[PDB]
Amino acid sequence: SVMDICDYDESSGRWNCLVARQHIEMSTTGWVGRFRPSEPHFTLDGNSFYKIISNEEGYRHICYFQIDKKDCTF
Amino acid sequence: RKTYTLTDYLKNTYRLKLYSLRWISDHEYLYKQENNILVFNAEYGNSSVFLENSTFDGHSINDYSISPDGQFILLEYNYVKQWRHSYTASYDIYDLNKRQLITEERIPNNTQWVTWSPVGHKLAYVWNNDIYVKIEPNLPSYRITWTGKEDIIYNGITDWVYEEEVFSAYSALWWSPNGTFLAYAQFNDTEVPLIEYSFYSDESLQYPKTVRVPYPKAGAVNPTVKFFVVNTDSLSSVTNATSIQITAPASMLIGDHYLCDVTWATQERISLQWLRRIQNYSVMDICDYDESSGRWNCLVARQHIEMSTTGWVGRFRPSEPHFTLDGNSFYKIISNEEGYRHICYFQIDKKDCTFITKGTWEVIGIEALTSDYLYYISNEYKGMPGGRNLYKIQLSDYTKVTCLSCELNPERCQYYSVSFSKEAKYYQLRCSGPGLPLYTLHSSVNDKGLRVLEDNSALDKMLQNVQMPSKKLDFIILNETKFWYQMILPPHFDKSKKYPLLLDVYAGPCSQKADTVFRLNWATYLASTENIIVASFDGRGSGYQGDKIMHAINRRLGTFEVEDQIEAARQFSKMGFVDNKRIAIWGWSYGGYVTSMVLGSGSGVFKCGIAVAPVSRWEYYDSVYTERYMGLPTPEDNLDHYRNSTVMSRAENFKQVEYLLIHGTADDNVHFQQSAQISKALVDVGVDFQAMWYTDEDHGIASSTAHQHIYTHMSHFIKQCFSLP
Amino acid sequence: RKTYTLTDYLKNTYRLKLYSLRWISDHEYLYKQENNILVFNAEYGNSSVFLENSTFDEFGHSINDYSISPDGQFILLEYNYVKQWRHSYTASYDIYDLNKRQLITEERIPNNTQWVTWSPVGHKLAYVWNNDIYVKIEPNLPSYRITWTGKEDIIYNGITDWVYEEEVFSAYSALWWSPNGTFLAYAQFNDTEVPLIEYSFYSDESLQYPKTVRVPYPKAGAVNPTVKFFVVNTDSLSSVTNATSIQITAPASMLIGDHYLCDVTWATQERISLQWLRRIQNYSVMDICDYDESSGRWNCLVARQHIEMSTTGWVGRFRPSEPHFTLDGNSFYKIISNEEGYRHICYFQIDKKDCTFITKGTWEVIGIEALTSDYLYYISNEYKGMPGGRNLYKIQLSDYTKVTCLSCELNPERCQYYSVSFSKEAKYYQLRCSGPGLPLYTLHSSVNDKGLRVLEDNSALDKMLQNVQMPSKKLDFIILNETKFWYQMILPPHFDKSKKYPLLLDVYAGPCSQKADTVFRLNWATYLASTENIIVASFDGRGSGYQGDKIMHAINRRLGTFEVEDQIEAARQFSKMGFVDNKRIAIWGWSYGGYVTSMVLGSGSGVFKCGIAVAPVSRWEYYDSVYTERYMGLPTPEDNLDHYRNSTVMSRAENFKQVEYLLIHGTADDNVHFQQSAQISKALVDVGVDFQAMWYTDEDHGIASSTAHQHIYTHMSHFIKQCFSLP
Ligand SMILES: *[C@@H]1O[C@H](CO)[C@@H](O[C@@H]2O[C@H](CO)[C@@H](O)[C@H](O)[C@H]2NC(C)=O)[C@H](O)[C@H]1NC(C)=O
Ligand SMILES: CC(C)Cn1c(CN)c(-c2ccccc2)c2cc(OCC(N)=O)ccc2c1=O
Ligand SMILES: CC(C)Cn1c(CN)c(-c2ccccc2)c2cc(OCC(N)=O)ccc2c1=O
Ligand SMILES: *[C@@H]1O[C@H](CO)[C@@H](O)[C@H](O)[C@H]1NC(C)=O
Ligand SMILES: *[C@@H]1O[C@H](CO)[C@@H](O)[C@H](O)[C@H]1NC(C)=O
Ligand SMILES: *[C@@H]1O[C@H](CO)[C@@H](O)[C@H](O)[C@H]1NC(C)=O
Ligand SMILES: *[C@@H]1O[C@H](CO)[C@@H](O)[C@H](O)[C@H]1NC(C)=O
């Protein structure tokens, strides 16, 4: 599963999901999400978000993501 | 009583001497001496010979190149031209001291581009579409890229359209000021469609070759580009060199875009300008190197924009930046609040730059920047757009700006360019007219005249025995606007006679065919021998007069610049020394398009004309150029006009004129197709016309024999249309 | 009062009426009246309507052509016509049951069909599609797929490739039915190593990028197509089992190297004759092949091979002649060069080796037109020793010395060129007469050779041309080295021998060419003579045809030599005749003609002021192998490379400084490639010669589009007029 994050281009009037802000969630041992990928909760500015994902041990926990980094922090 | 004949032009009987030099350092330059090359000292004047170069002990050397430090010379031979700038050659290096060839680790045959570092003797070349680096001439190369594939990936070199239209160069390599980094662009033509044409070759080629070039015509899939930098120091041998991608900014990544400038700011600062495919929007990015990362970060505050609501941005592209030494500031020529192109002093942090120049004239380019002065060329003097002069401006106080070239020679010299010494301590002034060219060397220390390098008195001498034509530059006012023109006037020009007129037209966006440049060309012969007035006219679309005039044809090629060449002819005939019945018109490329369009207009003014490699409809010509002015040819953008502005649609009107269509069959640029469609259009309405194709000649029709042939054929045609014996 | 103008020619004001009829039985034929297709009865004429054209106007497509089934029960209807080369094309086809009266809609013939043909009797259908052969027994039944190997531009089953179309078979077809439709014989052509000619097609201004057309075309000395031959049995096809074709291989002496299949003729229901030609085209073999029941194979007994060869040149005029088998197929007639070098009818027996000639003389049999059991009918130029006349003769098979001329005397002033079309069993014949007077079409019975009627006599064109000052043709000869050589002159009206007329020389001059004949024509020359007062002349010199091999094989291995010299001489003779302005002699032509023109202008003769070369050959290495090599051999050190080297137009570039030259070539020319002219132009540029040029975008070798055809003649007219200072 791939999370895209799309910004409105003001002068263009169009939407643009930068590939640098694509986030991959995938599962090596099964499917992704409990019944589906967990929804994100954004910080006010939307530069950042929290999300339930399975950790390295298989347990689902709240990961803190930056709009621009691949890596999160549990 | 002798005139400048067709054969004088064709055989270069009357040669203009040049003084082409190059600055090895701040005090000395190089100059050719038939074959020998001497090292002139600009200070004292004394020199010393260094080489005998024109086939040097087994091949004939096409060009040379000194390594900044003066330790190695790079010899270029086996030159095989590709397009307008691109070519291929073999290269050899000498230990410039010992005068002995570097025999081991030779630079490979068929190299597409080579370059020294700006200091030292580092060497970066491209070969089979990939970038290689050489820290020493004798050590083996380190291979920077591995993705190069012919006609598809270009690492460090341009593809057709960037070469022609964006960079005006083959190279897409840029060393850092201190030879530590090599920045480069990589272009992808994978989904770019190929123009295909036959190449016939020597007659021993039994089957004609099909040449296939990736070439984006208006609307087609353009190429894409990625940009990279790599540390040329710390260049490991056991491992592929890593290259740090600077990505384009988000606003550009939204859609089709180009890379349109690359400028280093310091050792660790690099600036890139990107252009939306719709070229009314561009963006500069200033990128500092991160020592703690190995990476390049460009701030969003640091970004700048170059907008344009009335047309495109730039003359042909966004103007380049010239950074003060520190790198926290730079100057860039831009379109001012009411159209005129002027220098703007930018601080890296804020956006608001204040203009260091203003007025109803444009600066043509920034030439030199120092700690206390900025040197630039402009057409201010006597409000003449077709003049060029060198201006020195006080960075300390902007109101106080001296013109350096304006007054050196009023009558002989109104069109100067300049070449500065490595630092600026001295500089050369090229004066291209309106009199015979003059090359002079100046000390910038006290802006004093040091010496005359070449005054062309040789050509002057033998031109007094020749009845040369006269050149008149001037303007006419239309709708309260100053519209400039030039006339090549037969000798003994008596204006109670009625001469025939050949209208010489380019007329494309930002053209200038009416200027102060001295020329020995086909027009010289026409006026001197055939007593034809050859004239040009800078109408709407022309450059160096402000955007009011230049943007006048925005999204509207084929309209006002065509309409304005016609009133030009009306105005000339109104001056009372033109034969109404013998006004001709001709042009090449855009000029061919405009000539055709005029001949297609039904105006009644022109008797005949010659179009050479003309554009016939804009869908055929390349995307980068065309779209800048026309936009995309889609019903939701500008398709309607693309359709309305073709010469084919005006075939019926060629029934009133005599037309000569010339086109080279291996034109990579304006494709034969364009003329193939004009002819078919003309055939289908039943219009008779004259035709000439040139087998295997490109857009230059530049072969010795075809250049000779085209001009003879065109003279015969003009003479006949004009009833001249 | 008023003359024959350019616009007259171009627009076609003065129409020439044909009478195109189609025999279907021995007694009857199909004509097209006011579109409505009628059938006529040659005996009497009680000729009611056959297929009123009120039928096919709610068809919803354009009836390009048609074709009745032989037994008369169905009607193939061609539409969606898209021309390929000279003969080839594709189209859509619907069949229409005449008896049931409806159009068949099941198991239809596919769009894009390359060729269709009925069986000769009944109503079987063979057709080619996507390079494979399909057969129908009934129109409404599924096709039986005979071949599974066809591939675009590579393997051609039952149709010819480029070079076999243009040069060998003069047809797209390569399908031959047995006389009662039992067997279908066919050629397979493999072009794998045949290199491709490539050229730009620009299409409509709407096409943004030029298309690159790619045709397999063997130029002189290149790898040629190879050919295989098969016969399959159409009465024993099956749904369950793939139809198995039987190959007839070429004889030993042909397999030894490159070769061509050059003729296929059925002798009987169970006997086929094949003629093969070696790549060096001076040796050819006819195989007579018989069906064998027990094996199911075809045996081509070595003892019945018939060798035809040439010592002086090549075999055939352009290809060995076709045999004409007697009913029992045990014997045949064909035209072959005799020991004197004159082409004549020779009677061969299957078993025996030597023939008996039944015609002879210093004239040639042109074609065998029909064979019954009582008479052999043929066309020759015997009459009045005019090699440019054509007449019908009938040989009495019981005593071949008894020979009658059917057409000679019918109308000798008006009529000296004749072609003929016989009814199915030859009991009736249409005579078509092409000049020197107005064309005349007439129907005749073979029983007495009684003249039944005039089909078309063009009186409309006549009572119309009387108000026009027409030129006169003069057909005559001059003598060079004991030999008659013939020429024709279109002479302006009121031609006066006191006057120096400007002269244009209309040249072909290729091997077996003949531009001096009694044919009547309305063309560009008719305009140049009627309006511009220019004598258009043509001259058949060495190389030219129908005058024996001594003349025709004179240019053997030596193109661009004698045929060129002879044109310069004809000019000299025409000047010496005293009614020509030496200062205004032009020369023009097309193909070979444009090569000769170009070779003449580059000759330094000084005789000619100007010329026009339209789609010229410039260098024989550029032209196709089958034609060029027949005359030039191979372009190798071991054969004839030096003369290929010598015979180029480009090598004479310098001497175009001595003439005014117009070079015209269409860019999509598949036959004489634009290359050829691109190389002439280039050579002329490299030596500083000025000249006129004109390309025609997307036009081919015919420059035949309505608007292009008009443009070219208009442009050539201006050039000529100007070369001759005409107003
Ligand atoms: C050049 O650009 C093309 C796309 O225009 C790239 O090829 C896509 O590449 C991916 C990944 O390899 C493939 O799965 C797609 O199928 C490709 N599409 C096409 C049309 O080729 C190519 O990889 C790029 N190369 C470089 C060096 O940038
Ligand atoms: C803009 C540059 C980056 C490249 N460039 C181009 C690229 N479009 C063209 C040109 C313009 C329209 C059509 C085809 C070519 C051109 C045309 C010139 O015309 C001479 C005349 N007609 O007087 C001179 C120079 C140039 C030129 O330098
Ligand atoms: C012989 C056939 C099998 C095919 N064929 C060929 C062979 N390709 C040629 C020809 C000869 C040399 C060069 C290119 C074409 C030709 C040329 C003609 O020119 C007429 C004139 N110039 O007045 C008319 C007809 C033909 C023609 O029918
Ligand atoms: C082509 O032929 C098919 C069947 O052979 C027919 O049904 C169809 O209408 C034709 N047209 C197109 C556009 O395919
Ligand atoms: C055609 O091409 C080559 C001969 O060059 C051969 O390999 C192949 O068998 C041939 N194909 C057919 C279908 O005959
Ligand atoms: C016929 O031959 C084809 C091609 O070799 C093959 O694929 C198929 O099995 C056969 N088809 C029929 C209808 O027997
Ligand atoms: C057609 O010819 C074949 C082979 O000779 C023969 O067997 C058959 O009877 C003939 N058919 C007709 C209808 O005469």
GROMACS .gro file of N, CA and C in nm, chain B residues 263-311:
model
  147
  337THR      N    1   2.417   2.782  -1.270
  337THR     CA    2   2.521   2.877  -1.231
  337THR      C    3   2.575   2.842  -1.094
  338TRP      N    4   2.706   2.822  -1.085
  338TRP     CA    5   2.773   2.807  -0.956
  338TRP      C    6   2.780   2.943  -0.889
  339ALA      N    7   2.763   2.945  -0.756
  339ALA     CA    8   2.768   3.069  -0.678
  339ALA      C    9   2.900   3.080  -0.602
  340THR      N   10   2.937   2.973  -0.533
  340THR     CA   11   3.067   2.965  -0.466
  340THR      C   12   3.122   2.823  -0.487
  341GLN      N   13   3.221   2.784  -0.408
  341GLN     CA   14   3.272   2.646  -0.412
  341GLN      C   15   3.161   2.548  -0.369
  342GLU      N   16   3.077   2.594  -0.276
  342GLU     CA   17   2.974   2.511  -0.212
  342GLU      C   18   2.831   2.563  -0.234
  343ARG      N   19   2.813   2.654  -0.331
  343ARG     CA   20   2.680   2.703  -0.366
  343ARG      C   21   2.656   2.691  -0.516
  344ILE      N   22   2.539   2.640  -0.553
  344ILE     CA   23   2.504   2.618  -0.693
  344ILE      C   24   2.358   2.659  -0.714
  345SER      N   25   2.330   2.730  -0.823
  345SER     CA   26   2.194   2.780  -0.850
  345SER      C   27   2.138   2.724  -0.980
  346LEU      N   28   2.013   2.679  -0.974
  346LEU     CA   29   1.945   2.620  -1.089
  346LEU      C   30   1.815   2.697  -1.112
  347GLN      N   31   1.784   2.723  -1.239
  347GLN     CA   32   1.655   2.781  -1.276
  347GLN      C   33   1.579   2.681  -1.361
  348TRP      N   34   1.453   2.661  -1.326
  348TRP     CA   35   1.367   2.568  -1.396
  348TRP      C   36   1.251   2.644  -1.457
  349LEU      N   37   1.205   2.596  -1.572
  349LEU     CA   38   1.101   2.662  -1.650
  349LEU      C   39   0.984   2.566  -1.668
  350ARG      N   40   0.863   2.607  -1.631
  350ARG     CA   41   0.743   2.531  -1.667
  350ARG      C   42   0.735   2.517  -1.819
  351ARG      N   43   0.672   2.410  -1.867
  351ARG     CA   44   0.662   2.387  -2.013
  351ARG      C   45   0.582   2.496  -2.081
  352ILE      N   46   0.478   2.544  -2.014
  352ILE     CA   47   0.423   2.676  -2.042
  352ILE      C   48   0.522   2.776  -1.983
  353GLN      N   49   0.594   2.848  -2.069
  353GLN     CA   50   0.709   2.927  -2.024
  353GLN      C   51   0.676   3.071  -1.980
  354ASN      N   52   0.566   3.088  -1.906
  354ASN     CA   53   0.534   3.216  -1.843
  354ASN      C   54   0.569   3.212  -1.694
  355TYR      N   55   0.626   3.100  -1.650
  355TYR     CA   56   0.654   3.074  -1.509
  355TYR      C   57   0.788   3.001  -1.496
  356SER      N   58   0.880   3.058  -1.420
  356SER     CA   59   1.010   2.994  -1.395
  356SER      C   60   1.048   3.009  -1.250
  357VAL      N   61   1.144   2.928  -1.205
  357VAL     CA   62   1.184   2.928  -1.065
  357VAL      C   63   1.333   2.905  -1.046
  358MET      N   64   1.396   2.994  -0.970
  358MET     CA   65   1.537   2.979  -0.933
  358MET      C   66   1.546   2.911  -0.797
  359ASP      N   67   1.649   2.829  -0.778
  359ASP     CA   68   1.676   2.763  -0.651
  359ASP      C   69   1.825   2.779  -0.621
  360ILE      N   70   1.858   2.816  -0.498
  360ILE     CA   71   1.996   2.833  -0.456
  360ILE      C   72   2.028   2.720  -0.359
  361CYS      N   73   2.131   2.642  -0.390
  361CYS     CA   74   2.157   2.517  -0.319
  361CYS      C   75   2.295   2.515  -0.253
  362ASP      N   76   2.297   2.512  -0.119
  362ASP     CA   77   2.422   2.500  -0.042
  362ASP      C   78   2.458   2.352  -0.021
  363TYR      N   79   2.587   2.320  -0.029
  363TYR     CA   80   2.636   2.184   0.000
  363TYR      C   81   2.634   2.160   0.150
  364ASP      N   82   2.596   2.038   0.190
  364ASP     CA   83   2.593   1.999   0.332
  364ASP      C   84   2.712   1.907   0.364
  365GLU      N   85   2.814   1.964   0.429
  365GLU     CA   86   2.937   1.890   0.463
  365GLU      C   87   2.907   1.772   0.554
  366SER      N   88   2.811   1.790   0.645
  366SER     CA   89   2.772   1.684   0.739
  366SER      C   90   2.691   1.571   0.673
  367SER      N   91   2.636   1.595   0.554
  367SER     CA   92   2.553   1.496   0.483
  367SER      C   93   2.624   1.434   0.363
  368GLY      N   94   2.700   1.516   0.290
  368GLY     CA   95   2.748   1.481   0.157
  368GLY      C   96   2.648   1.525   0.052
  369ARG      N   97   2.550   1.605   0.095
  369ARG     CA   98   2.429   1.633   0.015
  369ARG      C   99   2.403   1.781  -0.008
  370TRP      N  100   2.307   1.808  -0.097
  370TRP     CA  101   2.271   1.943  -0.136
  370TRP      C  102   2.128   1.979  -0.095
  371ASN      N  103   2.116   2.088  -0.019
  371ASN     CA  104   1.987   2.137   0.029
  371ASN      C  105   1.960   2.280  -0.018
  372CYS      N  106   1.846   2.300  -0.084
  372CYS     CA  107   1.804   2.431  -0.134
  372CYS      C  108   1.680   2.476  -0.058
  373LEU      N  109   1.687   2.592   0.007
  373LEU     CA  110   1.576   2.642   0.091
  373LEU      C  111   1.461   2.701   0.010
  374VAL      N  112   1.340   2.693   0.066
  374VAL     CA  113   1.219   2.741  -0.001
  374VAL      C  114   1.207   2.894   0.009
  375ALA      N  115   1.261   2.951   0.116
  375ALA     CA  116   1.271   3.097   0.127
  375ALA      C  117   1.368   3.148   0.022
  376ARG      N  118   1.483   3.081   0.012
  376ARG     CA  119   1.586   3.118  -0.086
  376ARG      C  120   1.534   3.119  -0.231
  377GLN      N  121   1.432   3.039  -0.261
  377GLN     CA  122   1.373   3.035  -0.395
  377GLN      C  123   1.328   3.172  -0.443
  378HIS      N  124   1.332   3.191  -0.574
  378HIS     CA  125   1.274   3.308  -0.637
  378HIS      C  126   1.186   3.263  -0.753
  379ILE      N  127   1.103   3.355  -0.801
  379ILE     CA  128   1.014   3.331  -0.914
  379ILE      C  129   1.044   3.433  -1.022
  380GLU      N  130   1.026   3.394  -1.147
  380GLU     CA  131   1.021   3.490  -1.258
  380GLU      C  132   0.886   3.468  -1.332
  381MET      N  133   0.789   3.555  -1.302
  381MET     CA  134   0.655   3.552  -1.361
  381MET      C  135   0.655   3.623  -1.496
  382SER      N  136   0.552   3.596  -1.577
  382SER     CA  137   0.519   3.682  -1.692
  382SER      C  138   0.373   3.669  -1.730
  383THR      N  139   0.298   3.777  -1.711
  383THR     CA  140   0.154   3.777  -1.737
  383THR      C  141   0.120   3.815  -1.882
  384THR      N  142   0.213   3.883  -1.950
  384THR     CA  143   0.191   3.931  -2.087
  384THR      C  144   0.247   3.837  -2.193
  385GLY      N  145   0.346   3.757  -2.155
  385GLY     CA  146   0.403   3.660  -2.249
  385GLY      C  147   0.484   3.550  -2.182
   0.00000   0.00000   0.00000
